[PDB]
Design a protein around this ligand. Structure first.
Ligand SMILES: [Mn+2]
Ligand SMILES: [Mn+2]
Ligand SMILES: [Mn+2]
Ligand SMILES: [Mn+2]
Lengths: 198, 198, 198, 198
């Protein structure tokens, strides 16, 4: 069984960048529904798989991608944020960011452009291409997880679903993006990067 | 040139079902951006078309569908709502609703299920199938317009993008749906129905 | 497991409408490949689910739908064809066709148009809509199965992948469709129909 | 307007690798159909845009992309092949291939794998990523053009629609791909490469 992970900090720790109300709703309401529905969907799939029912397996695909992706995406997101984050990364990561994007500022612009640009609900990702051996920016629609649909290893994800910023920033997505850079836990994205730095 | 249509009522007229803040942001901010970007996108397309630049035409497709759909969808939506709406439709429409869905209650359930069920951003629609000659329920992702992507004539649309209900109903989409039935302008959906009742 | 079903007639039984070469290749090579890969994908999916690896489950989705759908679709297709086929259906199926499509001829035109109209690889389908109690024509891309992705119950399917007709009819898909009507197994289509009008 | 380009060699010039029958059908029938329908779709799109009919513009999108892409793709494809082709590229293109893919052999494997791997109809592409300054392999479904849907600049394209190889290689796509390497026009691919490294 999958579980709702605990937040590494209090709901009001990312203030004033992302307010406590969004953090509470996002985690306790949105993420909780994903794991519950994921466990419900996985049990159904186990029933379908055992019967060799291919129709049921295919019909169940959207719910699993949506809920399974929802769980995966949000789980990474909480670890990517920190009340002690912000600033710039250091060491190997910064080294690779300058190499692949030109500069840290250029990387920020690319990821922001990618995030602001998703039409509808989605995610902006900084990922690692294990085949090519470099960093890569990608945008994923709805809850489609990065690794599962793209093959890239997720390092940093930015949720651009409206529930992630509307209460505080309303329709101005760029304001939310400008603000989230102040709480990015570079300590965690450097770890994820090192984990696949092979 | 396309224009931002005026609302048929004051921003606070649909209260307490849909509050004035959502109505103001939704119309003055969201819809306004769609027409502006649509006009910008259409001019670009006219440049591409004149040059016979097929690459530019294809690259421009998402922006036109998103912004063009955005304009179309929201324009219909404002006419579908009214401070004097609610209740049940009468005459021909009600007659066709019972015929195609069993009862008005059954129709409500079907459209609600369709609307609550869109994964991500989208719309729930009551449309008319001119080929088959009956009413049909459909769900469209993001801003993909009903007629243009499906062929069905739009009668009643329900916006399930989070910006349409989050400030007031938060994550509980069903609450928003339960509430919107009280402001549905059946007078307008009966007109749209009669317009294609051929 | 899943196994390649034996054809209920020999490869040359549908001549001159569909030649023996196509039938042999379609069954022994194309369909066979789908079951082999379906078995492998299912085994991998079982592995992933036991370990709760949501990323692996999502990564396997395209393969499962394509190979599972390939098996499902072709398995129905073989039963939809017959050396004893052709003509028109009798009884209830025919009544339902007259009611839903105007006549059998109008139905022939519509299914033909939907098949000839698929861009790329795909299938043309006459399906049953359990929810509305009526017949419906739908087109599915590549190997996406009708029931698993649409909810409709498959009755008659027309494979419009180029491999189903190219050797004999080259690029002329309409010639292939005109010839397929002579081998449609209406006894089977009726059989499938009676099964869902329950 | 758009016109069917004359082949820069006769239909039997690529034998025994790609037979004359395929070349004749591919150019005179398949490609010709795309330009005819592209011209009609463009004319209809001009009508729609002049009238500001956003619904008609969106309804024409699938046709424009499929037929426009069909013209673009096949037009590049013909120039990518040559009776004088084969072997390996020289100079900068080869250097870029060694740098980005390890070697020419590894590059051959990757493009072959991406082509053989497309489910249904599509294309395998070696493209140029202007933003990152490197070579990249991509696969496009049906007739979706590389630049218009991906932003990458096309250098070499491999048509994996069954009509490009079925008559000669039947279902064995790997045989077709092994043979196509003998007629690749590296002078043209280099030409396209030099054009974007500007
Ligand atoms: Mn979220
Ligand atoms: Mn809206
Ligand atoms: Mn087939
Ligand atoms: Mn082709």
């Amino acid at each position: 069984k999958h579980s709702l992970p605990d937040l590494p900090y209090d709901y009001g720790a990312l203030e004033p960048h992302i307010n406590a109300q969004i953090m509470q709703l996002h985690h306790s309401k949105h993420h909780a529904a994903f794991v519950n529905n994921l466990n419900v969907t996985e049990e159904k799939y186990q029933e379908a798989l055992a019967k060799g029912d291919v129709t049921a397996q295919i019909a169940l695909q959207p719910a699993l991608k949506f809920n399974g992706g929802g769980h995966i995406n949000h789980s990474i997101f909480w670890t990517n944020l920190s009340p002690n984050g912000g600033g710039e990364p250091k060491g190997e990561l910064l080294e690779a960011i300058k190499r692949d994007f030109g500069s840290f500022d250029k990387f920020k612009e690319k990821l922001t452009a990618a995030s602001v640009g998703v039409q509808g609900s989605g995610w902006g990702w900084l990922g690692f291409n294990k085949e090519r051996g470099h960093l890569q920016i990608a945008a994923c629609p709805n809850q489609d997880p990065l690794q599962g649909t793209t093959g890239l290893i997720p390092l940093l994800g930015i949720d651009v679903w409206e529930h992630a910023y509307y209460l505080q920033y309303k329709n101005v997505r760029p304001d939310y993006l400008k603000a989230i850079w102040n709480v990015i836990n570079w300590e965690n994205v450097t770890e994820r990067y090192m984990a696949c730095k092979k």
